[PDB]
Amino acid sequence: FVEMVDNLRGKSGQGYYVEMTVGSPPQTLNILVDTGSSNFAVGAAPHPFLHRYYQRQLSSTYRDLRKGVYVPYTQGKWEGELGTDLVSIPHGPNVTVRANIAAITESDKFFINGSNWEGILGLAYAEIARPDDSLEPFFDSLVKQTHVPNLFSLQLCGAGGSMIIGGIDHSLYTGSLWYTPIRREWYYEVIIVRVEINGQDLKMDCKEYNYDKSIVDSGTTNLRLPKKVFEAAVKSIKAASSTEKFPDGFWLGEQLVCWQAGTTPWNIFPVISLYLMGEVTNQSFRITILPQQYLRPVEDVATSQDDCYKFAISQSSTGTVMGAVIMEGFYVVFDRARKRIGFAVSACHVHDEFRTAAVEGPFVTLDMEDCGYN
């Protein structure tokens, strides 16, 4: 797996991507690693933001499926043509598979102007595949057609990172891996059973933490929290960090907040602990994230010249989202074979000589199933 170490580039701001090849002969593309979707979708026309695009005409092995997809998002859409071709990951397992590929022919507010990737690797399950659950996702194909074991792991750094296809690499984490069940195979849905801020639980019904969903999503930047839990969550961190003062707009992601080089004090800000359903009845474990995770460098502002961070927590109609900023603290194992997700302390998380990112257990938590929304 030394092969696959450091095979990712990018950042929580713009996404993490892996190099892939598609078609015969191989056309190289940079492709967003997205555990929050299930389509393998690549730019296939000369949109001006794009460095590279898939040229089906140049591939002997391409096969048209004579079917189109139209894919709207909150504020983004794409449209494309469905087909299959031969797909490989240079710095992945040494195999080549025939995968579905959506050739993206039209899009709005999808590709990022200035980014270095040209497609999306949707790594979630068939259920949320577009247009329907009969379009086999890349990873299912990879598992079906080769002997690659049914799991992958992500270490997102932005301290790029590593995607280990088919296994786990011990160099990427410290301590022990703790596993939460995948509640259902659609998104990478999990159950948060308790939340503490600094060391004190919001003491709210845990069903709220997972209303209607909680998911792990390498293609969302932030920790996203339901309206009702975002209210409470911010209420507590806001009050936790009453040393200094910050505007109302900041907490709603409406303006950035700034300090000078070094003058950002993490320590006004509390660590955050999410307790996840464990593998055993009445057993949980917890993951603890630092302020460095929830306050992210907004790299360039010419209208300022300060350490200006954005508050990396936000609200949602669609549930908890554990995003890149949460994942950056951890080695995360998507153990599809066993319907579970493993978390360990990332060997590349950013830590002072004070606090740290932590994965701890067992804890005793009763009635954890009741925390899920049906």
Ligand X SMILES: COc1cccc(-c2cccc(CC[C@]3(C)CC(=O)N(C)C(N)=N3)c2)c1
Catalytic residues: 34, 217
- What is the footprint of ligand X within residues 50-79 (CB under 6 A)? 73, 76
Q: Contact region for ligand X (CB under 6 A) — 12-20, 205-213, 238-246, 285-293?
A: 12-20
Q: Contact region for ligand X (CB under 6 A) — 10-18, 92-100, 197-205, 297-305?
A: 10-18
Counting contacts by CB under 6 A, is residue 372 touching ligand X?
A: no
Counting contacts by CB under 6 A, is residue 36 touching ligand X?
A: yes
By the criterion CB under 8 A, which residues form the site for a second copy? Answer: 48, 68-72, 74-76, 79-81, 105-106, 108-109, 112-113, 130-131, 211-212, 226-227, 230, 249, 253-256, 301-304, 308, 310, 314-318
Q: State the burial class of residue 20 (Cβ atoms within 10 Å of its Cβ: 0-12, 13-18, 19+).
A: buried
In angstroms, what is the C-alpha Rg of the chain? 21
- The smaller minimum CB distance to a second copy, of residues 75 and 263, is found at 75
Query: Which among a second copy, ligand X, none contacts residue 136 (Cβ within 5 to 8 A by kind)?
Result: none
Query: Which among a second copy, ligand X, none contacts residue 105 (Cβ within 5 to 8 A by kind)?
Result: a second copy
Single out the residue of 7, 27, 30, 37 in contact with ligand X (rule: CB under 6 A). 37
- Measured in whole angstroms, how far is the alpha carbon of residue 6 from the centre of its chain? 17
Query: Which among ligand X, a second copy, none contacts residue 304 (Cβ within 5 to 8 A by kind)?
Result: a second copy
- Return all residues near 43 (Cβ < 8 A) that are at least 6 apart: 29, 50, 52, 53, 54, 104, 107, 111, 118, 119
Q: What's the N-to-C CA distance of the chain in angstroms?
A: 39
Contact 344, 331 (CB under 8 A): yes
- What is the footprint of ligand X within residues 158-217 (CB under 6 A)? 217
User: 264-273 burial string, b = 16+ CB within 10 Å, else e?
Assistant: beeeebbbbb
d(CA 41, CA 154): 20
Which pair of tokens denotes residue 299?
Answer: 């790299």
The dihedral formed by the CA atoms of 130, 135, 140 and 142, expressed in degrees to the nearest 10: -110
- The smaller minimum CB distance to a second copy, of residues 211 and 285, is found at 211
- The smaller minimum CB distance to ligand X, of residues 171 and 318, is found at 318
- The smaller minimum CB distance to a second copy, of residues 198 and 305, is found at 305
- The smaller minimum CB distance to ligand X, of residues 120 and 193, is found at 120
Single out the residue of 59, 84, 180, 221 in contact with ligand X (rule: CB under 6 A). 221
- What is the footprint of ligand X within residues 100-129 (CB under 6 A)? 110, 112, 120
Binding-site string for ligand X from residue 297 to residue 326, where x marks contact by CB under 6 A and - marks none: ---------------------------x--
Query: Which among ligand X, a second copy, none contacts residue 303 (Cβ within 5 to 8 A by kind)?
Result: a second copy
151 — phi, psi (to 5°)? Answer: -160, 160
Counting contacts by CB under 6 A, is residue 137 touching ligand X?
A: no
184 DSSP assignment? S
What number of chain residues touch ligand X (CB under 6 A)?
A: 17
- Return all residues near 41 (Cβ < 8 A) that are at least 6 apart: 71, 78, 80, 101, 102, 104, 119, 120, 122
Query: Which among ligand X, a second copy, none contacts residue 37 (Cβ within 5 to 8 A by kind)?
Result: ligand X
Contact 121, 31 (CB under 8 A): yes
Of 275, 254, 263, 324, residue with least CA distance to 296:
324
Complete DSSP assignment for 54-70 = --GGG-TT-EEEEEEEE
Query: Which among ligand X, a second copy, none contacts residue 70 (Cβ within 5 to 8 A by kind)?
Result: a second copy
Measure Cα distances from 120 to 5, 17, 37, 304, 334 in Å. 20, 9, 9, 33, 18
d(CA 311, CA 233): 13
- The smaller minimum CB distance to a second copy, of residues 213 and 349, is found at 213
* Contact footprint for ligand X (CB under 6 A): 12, 14-15, 32, 34, 36-37, 73, 76, 110, 112, 120, 217, 219-221, 324
